Amino acid sequence: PFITVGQENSTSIDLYYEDHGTGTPVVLIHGFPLSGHSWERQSAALLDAGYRVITYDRRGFGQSSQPTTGYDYDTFAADLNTVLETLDLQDAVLVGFSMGTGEVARYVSSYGTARIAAVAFLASLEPFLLKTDDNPDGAAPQEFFDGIVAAVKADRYAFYTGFFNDFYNLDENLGTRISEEAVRNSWNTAASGGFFAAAAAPTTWYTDFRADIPRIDVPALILHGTGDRTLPIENTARVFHKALPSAEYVEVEGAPHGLLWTHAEEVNTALLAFLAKAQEAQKQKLLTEVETYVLSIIPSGPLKAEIAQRLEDVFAGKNTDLEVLMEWLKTRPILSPLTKGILGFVFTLTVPSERGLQRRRFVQNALNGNGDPNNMDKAVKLYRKLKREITFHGAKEISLSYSAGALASCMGLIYNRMGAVTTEVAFGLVCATCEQIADS
Amino acid sequence: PFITVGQENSTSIDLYYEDHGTGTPVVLIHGFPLSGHSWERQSAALLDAGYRVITYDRRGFGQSSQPTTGYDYDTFAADLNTVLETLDLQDAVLVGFSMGTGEVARYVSSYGTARIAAVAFLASLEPFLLKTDDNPDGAAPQEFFDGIVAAVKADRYAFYTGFFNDFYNLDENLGTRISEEAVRNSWNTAASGGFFAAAAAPTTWYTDFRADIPRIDVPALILHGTGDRTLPIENTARVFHKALPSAEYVEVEGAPHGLLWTHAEEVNTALLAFLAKAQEAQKQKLLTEVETYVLSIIPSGPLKAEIAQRLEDVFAGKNTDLEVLMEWLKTRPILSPLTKGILGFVFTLTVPSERGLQRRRFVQNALNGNGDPNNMDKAVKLYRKLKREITFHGAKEISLSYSAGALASCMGLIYNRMGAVTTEVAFGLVCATCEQIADS
Amino acid sequence: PFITVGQENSTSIDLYYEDHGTGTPVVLIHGFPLSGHSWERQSAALLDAGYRVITYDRRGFGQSSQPTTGYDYDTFAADLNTVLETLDLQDAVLVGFSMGTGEVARYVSSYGTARIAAVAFLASLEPFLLKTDDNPDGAAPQEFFDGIVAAVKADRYAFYTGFFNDFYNLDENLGTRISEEAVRNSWNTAASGGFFAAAAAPTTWYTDFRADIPRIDVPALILHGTGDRTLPIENTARVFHKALPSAEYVEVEGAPHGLLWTHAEEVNTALLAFLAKAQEAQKQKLLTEVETYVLSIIPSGPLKAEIAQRLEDVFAGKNTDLEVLMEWLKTRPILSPLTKGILGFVFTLTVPSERGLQRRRFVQNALNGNGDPNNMDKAVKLYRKLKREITFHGAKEISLSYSAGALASCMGLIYNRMGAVTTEVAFGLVCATCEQIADS
Amino acid sequence: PFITVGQENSTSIDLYYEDHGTGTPVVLIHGFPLSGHSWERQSAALLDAGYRVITYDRRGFGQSSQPTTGYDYDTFAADLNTVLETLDLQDAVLVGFSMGTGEVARYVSSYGTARIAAVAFLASLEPFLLKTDDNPDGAAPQEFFDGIVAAVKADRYAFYTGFFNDFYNLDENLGTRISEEAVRNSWNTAASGGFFAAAAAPTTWYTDFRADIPRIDVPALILHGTGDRTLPIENTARVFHKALPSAEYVEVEGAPHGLLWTHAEEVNTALLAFLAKAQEAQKQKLLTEVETYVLSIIPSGPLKAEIAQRLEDVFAGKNTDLEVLMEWLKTRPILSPLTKGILGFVFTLTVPSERGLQRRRFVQNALNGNGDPNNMDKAVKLYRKLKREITFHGAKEISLSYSAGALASCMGLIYNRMGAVTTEVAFGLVCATCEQIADS
């Protein structure tokens, strides 16, 4: 599979990518000089955990096009933007390794965390590798990196051998954490890359990400091996943690630069933990917002408390019966039809096991709103806008511009299944609907 | 005349209604198994007293549609809501009889007393007819009502005969308080209803209105006959009065269930009295609203106390001299010109005996400010809107859409050309004028 | 509710009708001189039995328009055709009483049993009431009926009294099977009719239905009371049974002409029996047809037998689990995807309790058919035709004109819920799909 | 340029107006019998001082329509209201001369000081010119003004000669403070007016503005010449000052009525001083808005404090070196390139002495917007909209509709000098750019 990110002369620039599994999108950005297939140990684990795994090969690496231009992090991040937009990924998590951390930092800084839910940095370059006067926390001076470029240009194939020796810490890990054959494959992948890209890549390593770091607002994870030879822990992760103290910090003892394979077990554990925790963290903050908004329209009393209880139960994951819940709603004495309708919409939306209940009439009759053609006109116009929308805060603001009558019908469109919007947006709509009703 | 309240299959559900007279809207909700025409003795009296009488037939009764669904008080109240909103009634009084009492309680509870000014309950079902463990004040157990439904299903036509026998207490009242022909008509009206509705109605009688009662905030009247066979006074009105002690309680001695006809004179007397009382009650709440709004613009001090006292005196009926008041106003310090104008407007409006005093110059100069308001078009367009208006709340909301400058000029037009708007509307304007000034 | 069936001068001709309940449509055609409300005892029972009850008032009767034209069975049947077509009734059962049997016979003869599933004749006029030379089985000669017309014209109101005496056999049944009040109501309904229609109707009674009878192909029921005074059993039902020996014959002993009320219990039992039996009779013949067609594409073996067994189980009503059935289908070794797809469509369509299974991908991927735009073009064109169609034989023929590839996609449209067709038509499609595949 | 203020018969009533310069709006209302061009000496000074000068001709005067109706200050003020609302001026300063002072007083009184920031009265009519019993401080009685009207009607052209003799105090000022040619032009302007307006205007002079005066809440300036023959100082300004003691009072010694030209230097000085207090007040509120918006994108730390200080310094007028600031900006390690670009744009825009500093490379590369042709296209579309815009709030709103990428490139267009927008608009863009960045 390929995604076109540019054009070089008579040829086009396409990136090889892979899209597997169903769930929240997790983008895995490989490091030098490998490819997307490097994540296979992580990829295997993430697929088991019910995630949607997306991997791609950087330009001039793996199966991607090998142009002789655009080897800078502004172009690398631009490519990632194209990738995310082409696939239309929403609420996705970016995971970068080695060079890949640079792409994450730069994209977030330059394009914003709109589509991004969280970020993870494994074996990061950040904040600045170059050792200069203003940056004494650099790993090595300019002259050093110039040596690497010249080394690759001398003989890239022979370079790869020496490269992977410190990439995996073979003197320690060979025959224990990484096999001879596994290394052999990595070398093949390296050779498969572009000759130009090979020597062009090291110049990108001393990129100054210090300006990109503050723009990271989504939950972050910083992971790094102490036995990292290529990128020394202290010149990278340790100072990176000072720049981003909010980030979850993980130090894997004795892990080499290539810990994705060698210490895969420690990596998976740490990553899957961070992902599951950050997911439930944003689920709770979303559901508590929905609760307060829905309860805002319900009049204070013993009924309000009962509703609050059943809402908490389904939000907590306590598999309640839906036929019973709906029969309970239908039979309520002081609740207004619209209130019952909104509640009916919210319960079907949040309940995982629909159990087999056909779209109830009492909910449908509540949301239609007299079946005014004036109301259904604004409802489709709003529906068009919500299809493009993804953020909850984004979906709520644009919906607020519409009247309470138009909003109710819009909810009815979705309920009847004449509409296909994401849950975050659907919650945006219902919260906006509740807000208008509360002010009436 | 019909109002669509729903839809059943290929057909729509419309309720037959009647709208007569001009004045404050009085909605009369009939009981089982009759129709809106039952109120004819009350309607005749209410029309004489200059009220606007609105009657409608419950679904499956009289000239209304006869569906086989929606025979519950939640649906009954929804229908009433549609009726009130379709006609856009404001500050109206709901009067219920037998079953009609259930609709009043439920609507007030579920939809709020926004459009409602006061409520009346004649021969009420409230609070709970069903005799259970938690409710020993019930009239009869579940098994009893199951007999009635089965009795109606057996032969509804033959049932009506036995029903009206106790409905009017015929052994006593026939040939005395109700004629053979009058009952004959009642029987016809009963038969004219829906066959399904006939047997569906008794199940609604044991509805638990105990939760609906506390939500009654508007002035209430509870009337009931002591000789009521259908709904025994002690299991209904007496316990209802304990639940709603604020309500005006009337016990008609020896009156049967269908006292609307038999003891019509006693009923009319009591009802017109309560209505007249609720008018003065809402008149007071109107003047207290005007006081607070007028007082909102006057700066705290000894003058504010003097004005508030002088306002209370004229509101109480303590007939003050107007030439003196106006001379008193004219000579007040610290008073903004607009403030003196508003007060001058209020005083001429509230003082009964204007004595024959020519339109004061200082008020004209205080509000209008030497500029002729008639020339200003915005003042006239609002004046045009206020001529159509009747309610205080209706006049105040539409006036708020205009700027403070336009409102002052509008007040000037009324004062100058000896305005021809109702006092209730006139107060809406001044309160709206005060509200704009209070903010900026 | 009204349905316009014509126009008389400046006015239009509308028929009052009622549409209640959900299920198979049962049309109840009243007799002289009553209205649709006459069925109330039958109507009450039919609604309990989960039927859709449709009643209407004949022109010049009950709440219908009262024109001075069109009082002949060709017009009466034309009105019924309009009624059936306006409501778009499908697979409906016609039930006629007294005059109403004439409408059933004439409509079936003149318009065909396309929309009709079965017919019932209670207190029939058929085959010919007029006593002439060619028809000695007539009840009375021309001169007699001329007397009735003249009797109605003399005084219709006084006529009604004498009419209902023999209509109900009051000397026997009054105070036992029919109350004084019940009769009173019937008289009111009679008087409510048109003066012209009253005297015009008897001329319709001696209509020759002998030519209409052979055209009755749907299952029929003939019910009649032996104590029938208005229409003597021997001059009507007994000779009618000789003309239609296929019909289910029921003789209610001692029942009068008005047995709908008096002997309602015997009537309901007999009618509900005939309806339930005729329904299951057409359900079995439909399902056995579907079975043979579906099995035609499955290759002979142990798998074919297993499929046949699970098909019989769901058709018999044995509530099988659907998640299990679908998992069983998905996991089959030699079954082709299209075969699995067709089977997936058939099981969801026939299983009453969907249990809560989201539209399975394996079925969707089977029916899409490579997602050829050429196939989806013919599929919508066919879908348009099937929306108009209702008969299984009718739906199958028009579908056969389309290619196997186009048919599979059409099934996919319905499965995805982008289409709304009746079950009989849906079965027509699947059988046509199976037929094309079998010949490939 | 024209603004329609009414309609007279087949024709419409339009007022000629002029809108020049950028900044806070200053409305100049001319006197009798001239036009807006009379302010030319003031306009020249006000344009130099960076104001937005708006002048218009009164109905029947200058280039405005010459109707035969609406010659009263209620109509004059209505016209002014239309002008202010059509142009949607906000926080504007009204400056009136002779008759023009009447419009200011009346509009402020009748329409409120919503859009007005301050008011100025030069050679005022206020409070009341008519000499009566209740007003002994009047200049002349009714009979006198009737003489002027009759004088104009006799021969307006010959009247103009004698009028300007006392308007400018020609015996004193001719050949000294006003030239023969200047007067000649004034005469032409007078003759150019309407014949009807000419004789209708004097009747408006004895208008009672005494009630309008208290309604003036914005800061006021009262200027008047002692040598005023037309409107005697003691009967006008002196008594006006007693009515409005809060007002800034300026008496120009020996100045005639038409002091706008003769004593232009004294007038301008006094006026610009009074205006400068209100202008500097609104400049700061604009710069504080820009500051908060610019600081919004800078990440918290010691650097944020440093920037805010340097921003306050340049806004205060502290001539900071720009070459130093830009080098300081260029060398910051944690500032994002876009951030450096925006700040660079702001500094070049706010720093007066640009000192001939060439367009910095680092700013250009930040604003280029990744040289996306799609981003560059949207920027031009926005630039077209910004070319039409004039207000800061207006420029900010329309810019917010564009993406952050499109906004940055648009700033690049202006910075590179491929675009020409006003400073207020330019700030709108930069603030809109910051707002998008803050939201990510």
Query: DSSP per residue over B301-346, as a string?
Result: SHHHHHHHHHHHHHHHT----HHHHHHHHHT-SS--HHHHHHHHHH
Cα R_g (chain A), whole angstroms: 26
Q: Cα separations (Å) of C297 from C331, C350, D205, D230?
A: 18, 19, 104, 111
Structure tokens that stand for A331 in this block: 């039979």
Q: Cβ distance C331 to C342 under 8 Å?
A: no
Q: Cβ distance C187 to C51 under 8 Å?
A: no
Alpha-carbon gap: C147 to the closest alpha carbon of chain B (Å): 32
Cα R_g (chain B), whole angstroms: 26
A379/B265 Cα distance (integer angstroms): 54
C181/A268 Cα distance (integer angstroms): 85
DSSP at C399: H
DSSP at C20: E
Best residue in A73, A79, A110, A207 for a mutation probing chain D (most D CBs within 10 Å): A110
Query: Residue A117: which H helix or E strand, with range?
Result: strand A116-122
Closest CA to A119 of A212, A40, A21, A202: A212
D154-158 long-range Cβ contacts below 8 angstroms, 24+ apart: D156/D190, D156/D191, D156/D195, D156/D198, D156/D199, D157/D191
Pairing of strands B11-20, B2-8: antiparallel
Experimental method: X-ray
- Within 184-223 of C, beta carbons closer than 8 Å to A belong to none
Pairing of strands D116-122, A52-56: unpaired
B409/B416 Cα distance (integer angstroms): 10
A55/A89 Cα distance (integer angstroms): 13
C242/C229 Cα distance (integer angstroms): 21
Closest CA to D411 of D351, D352, D342, D354: D342
Chain B hits for A333, CB-CB cut-off 8 Å, are 74, 109, 208, 211-212
Q: Cβ distance C87 to C55 under 8 Å?
A: no
D347/C95 Cα distance (integer angstroms): 91
**Neighbouring C-beta atoms of residue B44, cutoff 10 Å:** 13
DSSP at B368: T
Contacting chains of B (3 CB pairs or more, <8 Å) are A, C, D
B380 touches chain D (CB under 8 A): no
For C354, the closest chain A residue by CA position comes to A356
Q: What share of chain B is helix, strand, coil (3-state, %, to 5)?
A: 55, 10, 35
Burial zone of B226 (CB within 10 Å; 0-12 exposed, 13-18 middle, 19+ buried)? middle
Sign of the four-CA dihedral A62, A66, A68, A71 = negative
Best residue in D215, D216, D217 for a mutation probing chain B (most B CBs within 10 Å): D215
D314/D322 Cα distance (integer angstroms): 10
Distance, CA of C355 to chain centre:
31
**What interhelical angle do D264-297 and D337-350 show, nearest 10?**
170
Structure tokens that stand for A375 in this block: 């109301």
Task: Categorise residue B236: left if φ over 0, alpha if ψ from -120 to 50, beta otherwise.
Answer: alpha
Closest CA to B53 of B16, B93, B13: B93
**Three-state helix/strand/coil letters over D290-331:** HHHHHHHHCCCCHHHHHHHHHHHHHHHCCCCCHHHHHHHHHC
Chain A hits for D296, CB-CB cut-off 8 Å, are none
CB nearest to B195's CB, from C1, C43, C184: C43
B436/B404 Cα distance (integer angstroms): 6
- For tokens 């002349």, the residue is D140
**Neighbouring C-beta atoms of residue A191, cutoff 10 Å:** 13
DSSP at B422: -
This structure's resolution (Å) is: 3.5
Q: Cα separations (Å) of D91 from D19, D84, D119, D218?
A: 16, 11, 11, 10
Structure tokens that stand for A1 in this block: 């599979």
Nearby residues of B40 by Cβ (< 8 Å), 6 or more positions away = none
D155/A314 Cα distance (integer angstroms): 92
Q: Cβ distance C48 to C101 under 8 Å?
A: no
**Three-state helix/strand/coil letters over B120-178:** EEECCCCCCCECCCCCCCCCECHHHHHHHHHHHHHCHHHHHHHHHHHHCCHHHHECCCE
Structure tokens that stand for C379 in this block: 């599929």
Contacts B–C by Cβ distance under 8 A: 49
Q: What share of chain C is helix, strand, coil (3-state, %, to 5)?
A: 55, 10, 35
CB contact under 8 A, D212 and B375: no
D431/D436 Cα distance (integer angstroms): 9
CB contact under 8 A, C18 and B160: no
Degrees (nearest 5) of the Cα angle D86, D90, D94?
A: 90
Structure tokens that stand for B89 in this block: 């009634």
Structure tokens that stand for D63 in this block: 């280039």
DSSP at D203: G
DSSP at A213: G
Closest CA to D435 of D391, D401, D389: D401
**Neighbouring C-beta atoms of residue A87, cutoff 10 Å:** 18
Structure tokens that stand for C315 in this block: 């058709």
Contacting chains of C (3 CB pairs or more, <8 Å) are A, B
Dihedral (C-alpha) B184, B185, B190, B191: value to the nearest 10 degrees?
70
Q: What would the DSSP string read from start to end of D22-63?
A: SSSEEEEE--TT--GGGGHHHHHHHHHTT-EEEEEPPTTSTT
CB nearest to D336's CB, from A109, A114, A217: A109
Q: Cβ distance C213 to C105 under 8 Å?
A: yes
A284/C306 Cα distance (integer angstroms): 48
C100/C110 Cα distance (integer angstroms): 16
Contacting chains of D (3 CB pairs or more, <8 Å) are A, B
Catalytic residues of D: 98, 228, 257
C426/C413 Cα distance (integer angstroms): 11
**Neighbouring C-beta atoms of residue B286, cutoff 10 Å:** 18
For A330, the closest chain B residue by CA position comes to B74
For C88, half-sphere exposure in the C-beta direction (CA atoms, 13 angstrom radius) is 7
Closest CA to B21 of B49, B63, B43, B51: B51
Structure tokens that stand for C177 in this block: 């099977």
Alpha-carbon gap: A138 to the closest alpha carbon of chain B (Å): 60
B44 touches chain A (CB under 8 A): no
Structure tokens that stand for B83 in this block: 């009726």
Closest CA to C394 of C66, C113, C27: C113
A188/A175 Cα distance (integer angstroms): 19
Strands of the sheet containing B2-8, edge to edge, are B2-8, B11-20, B52-56, B25-29, B92-97, B116-122, B220-225, B248-252
Query: Residue C97: which H helix or E strand, with range?
Result: strand C92-97
User: Could you give phi then psi for residue A213, rounded to 5 degrees?
Assistant: -55, -50
Best residue in B110, B111, B213 for a mutation probing chain A (most A CBs within 10 Å): B110
Burial zone of C334 (CB within 10 Å; 0-12 exposed, 13-18 middle, 19+ buried)? exposed
For A344, half-sphere exposure in the C-beta direction (CA atoms, 13 angstrom radius) is 32
Q: Cβ distance B386 to B335 under 8 Å?
A: no
D299 touches chain A (CB under 8 A): yes
User: Could you give phi then psi for residue A246, rounded to 5 degrees?
Assistant: -70, -25
User: Could you give phi then psi for residue D217, rounded to 5 degrees?
Assistant: -105, -25
Pairing of strands A248-252, A52-56: unpaired
For C78, half-sphere exposure in the C-beta direction (CA atoms, 13 angstrom radius) is 11
Query: Can you list the domains of chain C with their CATH numbers?
Result: 1-279 (3.40.50.1820), 280-366 (1.20.91.10), 367-440 (1.10.10.180)
- Within 251-290 of D, beta carbons closer than 8 Å to B belong to none
Catalytic residue among A35, A64, A65, A98: A98
CB nearest to D211's CB, from B336, B370, B405: B370
Best residue in C4, C184, C186 for a mutation probing chain B (most B CBs within 10 Å): C184
Structure tokens that stand for B153 in this block: 């299903």
CB contact under 8 A, C182 and B155: yes
For C206, half-sphere exposure in the C-beta direction (CA atoms, 13 angstrom radius) is 19
Burial zone of D354 (CB within 10 Å; 0-12 exposed, 13-18 middle, 19+ buried)? exposed
CB contact under 8 A, D212 and B370: yes
Count how many residues are written for chain D: 440
D383/D389 Cα distance (integer angstroms): 10
Catalytic residue among B43, B64, B98, B409: B98
Q: What would the DSSP string read from start to end of B407-421?
A: HHHHHHHHHHTT--S
Alpha-carbon gap: B415 to the closest alpha carbon of chain A (Å): 34
Closest CA to C168 of C267, C266, C255, C269: C255
A135 touches chain D (CB under 8 A): yes
B369 touches chain D (CB under 8 A): yes
Pairing of strands B52-56, B11-20: antiparallel
Alpha-carbon gap: A346 to the closest alpha carbon of chain C (Å): 18
Distance, CA of C302 to chain centre:
41
Q: Cβ distance D72 to D5 under 8 Å?
A: no
A315/A324 Cα distance (integer angstroms): 17
CB nearest to B68's CB, from C21, C180, C188: C21
Chains D and C touch (3+ CB pairs under 8 A): no
A245 touches chain C (CB under 8 A): no
Q: Cβ distance B395 to B386 under 8 Å?
A: yes
Told to judge if A98 belongs to the known catalytic residues of this protein, a careful annotator would answer yes
D83/D77 Cα distance (integer angstroms): 10
Alpha-carbon gap: A405 to the closest alpha carbon of chain B (Å): 15
CB contact under 8 A, D112 and B403: yes
Strands of the sheet containing D52-56, edge to edge, are D2-8, D11-20, D52-56, D25-29, D92-97, D116-122, D220-225, D248-252
CB contact under 8 A, A211 and D334: yes
Closest CA to D286 of D430, D437, D89, D116: D430
CB contact under 8 A, A335 and B110: yes
User: Could you give phi then psi for residue B67, rounded to 5 degrees?
Assistant: -80, 170
Degrees (nearest 5) of the Cα angle A256, A260, A262?
A: 55
Structure tokens that stand for C249 in this block: 């014959």
D428/D392 Cα distance (integer angstroms): 5
Nearby residues of A148 by Cβ (< 8 Å), 6 or more positions away = A202
Q: Cα separations (Å) of B213 from B103, B125, B128, D3?
A: 12, 12, 11, 62
DSSP at B97: E
D324 touches chain A (CB under 8 A): no
Closest CA to D347 of D377, D327, D376, D365: D327
Task: Categorise residue D50: left if φ over 0, alpha if ψ from -120 to 50, beta otherwise.
Answer: left
C180 touches chain B (CB under 8 A): yes
Question: In the beta sheet, which residues pair with residue B56?
Answer: B17, B29
Pairing of strands C2-8, B220-225: unpaired
**What interhelical angle do D392-399 and D373-388 show, nearest 10?**
150
Our separate counts of H helices and E strands in chain C read: 20, 8
Residue B272 one-letter amino acid: L
A419-423 long-range Cβ contacts below 8 angstroms, 24+ apart: A419/A383, A420/A387, A421/A383, A421/A386, A421/A387, A421/A389, A422/A90, A422/A390, A423/A349
Q: Cβ distance A248 to A222 under 8 Å?
A: yes
Best residue in D329, D336, D433 for a mutation probing chain A (most A CBs within 10 Å): D336
D238/D240 Cα distance (integer angstroms): 5
CB nearest to A417's CB, from C354, C355, C417: C417
Burial zone of C114 (CB within 10 Å; 0-12 exposed, 13-18 middle, 19+ buried)? exposed
Chain A hits for B3, CB-CB cut-off 8 Å, are none
Burial zone of B361 (CB within 10 Å; 0-12 exposed, 13-18 middle, 19+ buried)? exposed
Structure tokens that stand for B24 in this block: 């404050």
Closest CA to B154 of C52, C40, C53, C167: C40
Q: What would the DSSP string read from start to end of C405-419?
A: HHHHHHHHHHHTTS-
